[PDB]
Ligand binder design. Structure first.
Ligand SMILES: *[C@@H]1O[C@H](CO)[C@@H](O)[C@H](O)[C@H]1NC(C)=O
Ligand SMILES: *[C@@H]1O[C@H](CO)[C@@H](O)[C@H](O)[C@H]1NC(C)=O
Ligand SMILES: *[C@@H]1O[C@H](CO)[C@@H](O)[C@H](O)[C@H]1NC(C)=O
Ligand SMILES: *[C@@H]1O[C@H](CO)[C@@H](O)[C@H](O)[C@H]1NC(C)=O
Lengths: 51, 504, 51
């Protein structure tokens, strides 16, 4: 992967035509997104009052 | 510490760009080979760029080389007990005319047994014949249908972890430090991938050392008491009853319960006995301390001394006497990584302060070098006989490195260069000689031994006969001393013969 | 290594877990792991296998 929607991500010295690519992602409130392939998730309820 | 065995296999193999504006890199891909080193050394991987004067290195740290095995399978065998129950009823109808199962009815549960529970476990719905008449409680001269159900339980909850293996390939630990600053550790195997991290795939190679009496051994360990033992274990699900390999299950957290959906048992693991509407069950499952060849944490079977080394992903080790293996070289492959280069190196000059160490031996000769510069770490020392690279800090500090020399009086002139600037240094000092240490009682080897230098094994006439007392004067003095000692021993022998002759 | 063309029989990767970990260990051997592994220059017997 070199560029995502006109956003510089890596150094490839050249761009190609757009092509779909399936990959998971997550946000932390920053500008750009972070894609991850191998990840271990865990669902916790915690009995919070907001729910 | 010090470093040795430089490679420089893929120098000037970059296709970068202006570098984010001032100076950056994109990617470096190639392949190199690291030879075997002694336990407690560092193998540096220095890169070279055509534009930048110097770059960082990649150090490889090895601490212990233990004899471990692979993991053929993983399972947990819980402890089981003997539990059974029955019920006595009467025919009273046409349901129990002649036999209990008409042709194939195995569901011996009339919505009354306790099998519909979460803690029951695995069992077998069996049945037999009973008594019929007034003496047992019915009013018909015909045997009544008496069903029985047995299962296993686990009151305590002891969980065991068994891992069969029959390879026993050499392995070691690697403390890799990336040039960026990250330091992580991992356990590579002999030719097996070691969870490549950021492209680096440094692997270890062995020599396929044979075993004396290691044919059927496993690494069964205990979780609660952390007790280890060496005993032959079973194989995968298709097994035979009579040894270790009783009712297993899926995982440890699922081993507390002996229920279905994960637990596997073949047949004939619990017996049934009944005389008169009793249906008692006897125990046949053996514990872990029941099969033959059951060892403990300290094991000295053959030349190997199996100890318990505190380490992650494995708690089985062992180290015989000095083996001096043939080769243990590594293989490093890269796929993609980022590194920053300064290329703003300024004038730097160092000098030598101290010098000491052994002869051409294991630990070598340590030399302290002092430098002074503004750049954080840009240095590359190159000289004849041996090459050593190290890192420095900003400002003026003191650093200690080790080099390999093959002469008692180390008086030469090496070239030292930091970044783009170069200078000259000199070494002057006296060294000593140390041979291979000897074995002493009460001490046992921990990991392994790599090699010992025993090539020369001959006295050097130059170093020897130096502090005793130019060559002509020394020969004359030796001759005079020899003649004096000859006259002395002749006088002593004459006196002895005179004393022996008379006074008989 | 996607399916529909790749072939594997069984028992090539193991699974290990103690408490919601599910760690996987490597068991595949490299090319320089089996016995009788020669190189480009080979002189086994009277034949001198060159390249
Ligand atoms: C125990 O080890 C001895 C010696 O290797 C062997 O002859 C014997 O069969 C082993 N016992 C079992 C139960 O495997
Ligand atoms: C160099 O001098 C002696 C010689 O070995 C050594 O003990 C000392 O620590 C060294 N100097 C410094 C500043 O470390
Ligand atoms: C040099 O080291 C100092 C302190 O360790 C650090 O603040 C600085 O960022 C380093 N310089 C570079 C170029 O990494
Ligand atoms: C390697 O070659 C020897 C001699 O031909 C043979 O005995 C041995 O079985 C071979 N090893 C393997 C793994 O085939």
């Amino acid at each position: 992967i070199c560029k995502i929607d006109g956003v510089v991500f890596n150094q490839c010295e050249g761009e190609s035509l757009p092509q779909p690519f399936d990959v998971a992602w997550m946000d932390v409130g920053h500008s750009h997104k972070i894609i991850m392939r191998e990840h271990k998730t865990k669902w916790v309820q915690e009995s919070s009052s907001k729910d | 510490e010090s470093c040795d065995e430089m490679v420089h296999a893929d120098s000037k193999l970059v296709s970068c760009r202006q570098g984010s504006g001032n100076m950056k890199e994109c990617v470096t891909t190639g392949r190199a080979l690291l030879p075997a080193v002694n336990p407690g050394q560092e193998a540096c991987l220095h890169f070279t760029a055509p534009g930048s004067p110097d770059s960082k290195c990649l150090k490889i740290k090895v601490k212990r080389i233990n004899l471990k095995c692979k993991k053929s399978s993983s399972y947990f065998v819980p402890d089981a007990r003997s539990r059974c129950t029955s019920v006595r009823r009467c025919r009273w109808a046409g349901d129990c005319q002649s036999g209990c199962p008409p042709h194939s009815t195995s569901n011996s549960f009339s919505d009354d047994w306790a099998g519909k529970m979460d803690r029951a476990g695995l069992g077998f719905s069996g049945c037999s014949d009973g008594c019929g008449g007034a003496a047992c409680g019915c009013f018909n001269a015909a045997p009544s249908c008496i069903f029985w159900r047995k299962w296993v339980e686990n009151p305590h909850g002891i969980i065991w972890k068994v891992s069969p293996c029959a390879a026993w390939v050499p392995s070691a630990v690697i403390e890799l430090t990336m040039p960026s600053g990250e330091v992580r550790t991992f356990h590579p195997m002999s030719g097996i991938p070691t969870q490549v991290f950021k492209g680096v795939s440094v692997t270890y190679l062995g020599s396929d050392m044979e075993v004396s009496g290691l044919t059927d051994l496993c690494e069964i360990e205990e979780l609660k008491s952390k007790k280890l033992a060496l005993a032959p274990c079973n194989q995968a699900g298709m097994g035979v009853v009579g040894k270790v390999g009783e009712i297993q299950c899926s995982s440890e957290e699922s081993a507390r319960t002996i229920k279905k959906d994960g637990c596997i048992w073949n047949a004939d693991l619990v017996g049934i006995e009944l005389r008169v509407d009793d249906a008692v069950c006897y125990s046949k499952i053996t514990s872990v301390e029941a099969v033959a060849n059951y060892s403990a944490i300290p094991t000295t079977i053959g030349g190997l001394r199996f100890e318990r080394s505190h380490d992650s992903l494995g708690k089985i080790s062992g180290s015989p006497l000095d083996i001096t293996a043939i080769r243990g070289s590594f293989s490093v492959n890269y796929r993609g990584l980022r590194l920053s280069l300064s290329e703003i190196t300024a004038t730097c000059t160092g000098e030598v302060t101290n010098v000491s160490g052994c002869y051409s031996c294991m630990t070598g000769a340590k030399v302290s070098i002092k430098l002074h510069s503004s750049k954080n770490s840009t240095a590359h020392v190159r000289c004849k006989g041996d090459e050593t690279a190290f890192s420095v800090l900003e400002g003026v500090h003191s650093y200690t490195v080790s080099l390999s020399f093959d002469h008692a009086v180390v008086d030469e002139q090496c070239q030292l260069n930091c970044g783009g600037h170069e200078s000259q240094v000199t070494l002057k000092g006296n060294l000593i000689f140390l041979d291979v240490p000897k074995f002493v009682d009460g001490s046992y080897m921990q990991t392994y031994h790599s090699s010992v230098p025993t090539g020369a094994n001959i006295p050097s006439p130059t170093d020897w006969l130096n502090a005793l007392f130019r060559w002509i004067l020394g020969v004359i003095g030796v001759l005079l001393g020899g003649l004096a000692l000859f006259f002395l021993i002749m006088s002593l022998f004459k006196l002895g013969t005179k004393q022996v002759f008379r006074s008989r």
